[PDB]
Amino acid sequence: QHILKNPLIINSIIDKAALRPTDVVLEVGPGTGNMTVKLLEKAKKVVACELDPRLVAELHKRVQGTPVASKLQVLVGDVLKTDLPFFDTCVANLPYQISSPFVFKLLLHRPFFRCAILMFQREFALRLVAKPGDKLYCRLSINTQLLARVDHLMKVGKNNFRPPPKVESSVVRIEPKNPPPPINFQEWDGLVRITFVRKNKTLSAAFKSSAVQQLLEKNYRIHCSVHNIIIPEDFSIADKIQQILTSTGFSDKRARSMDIDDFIRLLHGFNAEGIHFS
């Protein structure tokens, strides 16, 4: 993995974290411990989710003998699947291969944390903080922004890692929304996936897909059985989708232009007819 060598950058990440001396700090990807040792000087506890098991020997040996050692818990495993402890802030250097999943593991995690300071690849951070109509606005943008406040903090040159990556990196602060909106994020994501398949084409187009009609026909069958509704022998899911789309004015819009409130109105207009994306 790409270890962060630059003390200049590490020191800058740690102030952006703004550690209070009463905080549990989750560190994902402590590597050789370069940021771990500095975090331990300033935190009440440091929970380190090791990504490479081989590094764990020397990491514990590095802190061994200092008066901070009794604060370093180290969790060897698969961070995506492990249950996470209560932490107050999180700093983390993440590979792209787990970058999208980990962001939502953070945002769905309870109790809420205060903020996370995450190192990502360049383009990935720009998709997070991408506003509607931007070239890079995508499902990640609108999903992350529904649940969090995300801020692009600093660029980080690939010359600072050992061994260097091929792309520049960025540092990003993510503060969860607490309380989070009353949006059933399972359904929310289902709807947003369908409309971002082809984000420069219309929502009407987005629902003529067959995967879609299979998905919604399934869910609509459940609705009608739960509520003793009778599917008329001439019923068509596709026309129902198309009324809802027309009757909410969304039929000719494109997800590239759509902001969060727009999707809430879209979703409310589907759920109100018995259509769920589960």
Curated annotation (Swiss-Prot):
Gene3D superfamilies: 1.10.8.480, Vaccinia Virus protein VP39 (3.40.50.150)
Function: Specifically dimethylates two adjacent adenosines in the loop of a conserved hairpin near the 3'-end of 18S rRNA in the 40S particle. Involved in the pre-rRNA processing steps leading to small-subunit rRNA production independently of its RNA-modifying catalytic activity. Part of the small subunit (SSU) processome, first precursor of the small eukaryotic ribosomal subunit.
Family annotation (CDD domains): AdoMet_MTases (cd02440)
Binding site for S-adenosyl-L-methionine: H2, L4, G29, E50, D78, N93
Description of how the protein assembles with itself and partners: Part of the small subunit (SSU) processome, composed of more than 70 proteins and the RNA chaperone small nucleolar RNA (snoRNA) U3.
Membership in a protein family: Belongs to the class I-like SAM-binding methyltransferase superfamily. rRNA adenine N(6)-methyltransferase family.
Domain of life: Eukaryota
Location(s), subcellular: Nucleus, Nucleoplasm; Nucleus, Nucleolus
Enzyme class: transferase
Protein's GO biological process: positive regulation of rRNA processing; ribosomal small subunit biogenesis; rRNA methylation
Protein name stated in the entry: Dimethyladenosine transferase
Gene: DIMT1
GO molecular function: 18S rRNA (adenine(1779)-N(6)/adenine(1780)-N(6))-dimethyltransferase activity; RNA binding; rRNA (adenine-N6,N6-)-dimethyltransferase activity
InterPro entries associated with the record: KsgA/Erm, rRNA_Ade_Mease_Trfase_CS, rRNA_Ade_methylase_Trfase_N, rRNA_adenine_dimethylase, SAM-dependent_MTases_sf
Keyword terms, alphabetized: Methyltransferase, Nucleus, RNA-binding, rRNA processing, S-adenosyl-L-methionine, Transferase
E.C. no: 2.1.1.183
UniProt key word rRNA processing: yes
One of the record's GO cellular component terms: small-subunit processome
Subcellular location, principal: nucleus
Record-linked NCBIfam families: ksgA
Reaction it catalyzes: adenosine(1779)/adenosine(1780) in 18S rRNA + 4 S-adenosyl-L-methionine = N(6)-dimethyladenosine(1779)/N(6)-dimethyladenosine(1780) in 18S rRNA + 4 S-adenosyl-L-homocysteine + 4 H(+)
Claim: Hydrolase is one of the keywords in the record: no
Disulphide-bonded residues: none
Native species: Homo sapiens (Human)
